[PDB]
From Swiss-Prot:
<comment type="subunit">
    <text>(Microbial infection) Interacts with herpes virus 8 protein LANA1.</text>
</comment>
<comment type="subunit">
    <text>Homodimer. Interacts with E2F1. Interacts with (acetylated) STAT3; promoting STAT3 recruitment to chromatin. Interacts with CTCF; promoting BRD2 recruitment to chromatin.</text>
</comment>
<protein>
    <recommendedName>
        <fullName>Bromodomain-containing protein 2</fullName>
    </recommendedName>
</protein>
<comment type="function">
    <text>Chromatin reader protein that specifically recognizes and binds histone H4 acetylated at 'Lys-5' and 'Lys-12' (H4K5ac and H4K12ac, respectively), thereby controlling gene expression and remodeling chromatin structures. Recruits transcription factors and coactivators to target gene sites, and activates RNA polymerase II machinery for transcriptional elongation.</text>
</comment>
<feature type="domain" description="Bromo 2">
    <location>
        <begin position="5"/>
        <end position="110"/>
    </location>
</feature>
<comment type="similarity">
    <text>Belongs to the BET family.</text>
</comment>
Amino acid sequence: GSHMEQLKHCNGILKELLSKKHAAYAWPFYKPVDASALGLHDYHDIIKHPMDLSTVKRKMENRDYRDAQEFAADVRLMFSNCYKYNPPDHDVVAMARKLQDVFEFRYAKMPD
């Protein structure tokens, strides 16, 4: 799905995820996890491929993604990293699930 149209749909989703409408639970994913600042000294030993929305945005602007699948993989990687590092009961996981629901349902409306 290397269609320009599908990438526009992906960019729309990206814009929504970064919008005020979802800010209450999307904020933890706005920037790369600063492990040191947060005292998470084992973060990079556990998470081999960090990902966040600012990185996805940069890759989209630089036309790094060639198709929708690539984009989706990074967004899901971001959520997976959260589920892998954090205990299931952590508040950040609750926020990840909510933002992922927003993503999955709109990604499912992908024109094709």
